[PDB]
């Protein structure tokens, strides 16, 4: 349709939306209004937008040239550099030291400073979803990607020392979702089977937490996300239910701490946990064109009320 892409930046302070007409950034500093802070129409059919935190550096990809990465300074409206790959770009992740590009059968690790290719992981198991995760933390700067196309093995790669740090046998079922916490020392995982959500230490690969994801229904988990303090972990899917888990060792271990019921199910979505105006929120960007905003009570949990609902295209309906 009109919208092609939406995601949150590394600390959930900016929402990026890619569309046929271009791309936009929205501020996430308030719940009452979704303030547009930038729009660009220089590039049409923007299918990937990746900002470097709250700076002006952005990486974008267009359906019109899906093998070509453009790195730009968006406030100046200036292309910094570009890089062309042998196959369609499936995902772009960046932090303050590295930019990684995920193709179906290879991953590229660039120095963000000059975009020189530091290392290429070749002949990976086919990854048509572009499933990967990149730590936002400089001291624990790991990349996670599937180590097998039929088994839920996680390859964990040190993008600074350029060496495989570990293989985590997280699930037998193939991987469906991956997320690092903000410290880069924890990795959440989920499989296509979707029975348990696991949290592993990084790089050691010890299982720290295992959460049961509700009724035994067939589910395709699509989004895992940590709160910035690492205490909460959300998991959403093609289902109407988002589960929020609390990483505390003194509770009824393994059970969900809060839940959300979405008004729109049956499509992929992206979730994040952000404290906005001193209140922790669950944010859900959905395929119906809306951002939904729920309140989380960090002490009592339970069901989370829908507070606000905003159009991703920016229409102030």
């Amino acid at each position: 349709g009109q919208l092609l892409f939406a995601n949150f930046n590394q600390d959930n302070t900016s929402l990026a939306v890619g569309s046929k007409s271009g791309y936009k950034f929205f501020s996430l500093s308030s719940v009452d209004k979704l303030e547009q802070i930038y729009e660009c129409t220089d590039t049409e059919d923007v299918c990937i937008v990746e900002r470097l935190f709250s700076s002006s550096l952005v990486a974008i990809v267009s359906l019109k040239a899906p093998r070509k990465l453009k790195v730009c300074h968006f406030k100046k409206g200036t292309e910094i550099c570009n890089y062309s790959y042998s196959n369609t770009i499936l995902a772009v992740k960046l932090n303050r030291q590295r930019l990684i590009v995920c193709l179906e059968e290879s991953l590229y690790i660039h120095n963000i400073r000059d975009m020189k290719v530091l290392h290429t992981i070749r002949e990976t198991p086919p990854n048509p979803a572009g499933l990967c995760a990149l730590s936002i933390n400089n001291d624990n700067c790991y990349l996670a990607y599937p180590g097998s196309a039929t088994i839920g093995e996680v390859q964990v790669f040190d993008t600074i020392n350029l060496r495989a740090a570990n293989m985590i046998p997280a699930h037998d079922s193939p991987l469906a979702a991956l997320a690092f916490d903000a410290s880069g020392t924890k990795l959440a995982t989920a499989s296509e089977k979707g029975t348990v959500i696991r949290v592993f230490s990084i790089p050691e690969g010890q299982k720290l937490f295992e959460f049961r994801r509700g009724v035994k229904r067939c589910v395709s988990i699509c989004s895992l996300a940590f709160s910035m303090d690492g205490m909460f972990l959300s998991a959403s899917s093609n289902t109407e239910t988002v589960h929020i888990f609390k990483l505390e060792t003194v509770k009824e271990q393994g059970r969900a701490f809060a839940t959300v019921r979405l008004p729109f199910c049956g499509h992929k979505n992206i979730c994040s946990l952000a404290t906005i105006q001193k209140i922790p929120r669950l944010l859900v960007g959905a395929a119906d064109g809306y951002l939904y905003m729920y309140n989380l009570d960090p002490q009592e949990g339970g069901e989370c009320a829908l507070m606000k609902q905003h159009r991703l295209d920016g229409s102030l309906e």
Binding site: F53, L57, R113
Partner: protein
């Protein structure tokens, strides 16, 4: 009376606790502003280098 001293002390504590929380928020806000400025500086430097090269080419071809 010693109970008034307590009530004074507890008044003061509440004041300092409020001041202290105000300062922590100020510092967290400034830490964020500083981190953003660092990131913007890095974005500008990478863009400056790219302009440098683009200047080097356009003068060489010209």
């Amino acid at each position: 009376m010693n109970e008034a001293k307590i009530a004074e002390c507890l008044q003061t504590i509440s004041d300092l606790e409020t001041e202290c929380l105000d300062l922590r928020t100020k510092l967290c806000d400034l830490e964020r502003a500083n981190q953003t400025l660092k990131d913007e500086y890095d974005a500008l430097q990478i863009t400056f280098t790219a302009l440098e090269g683009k200047l080097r080419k356009t003068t060489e071809e010209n």
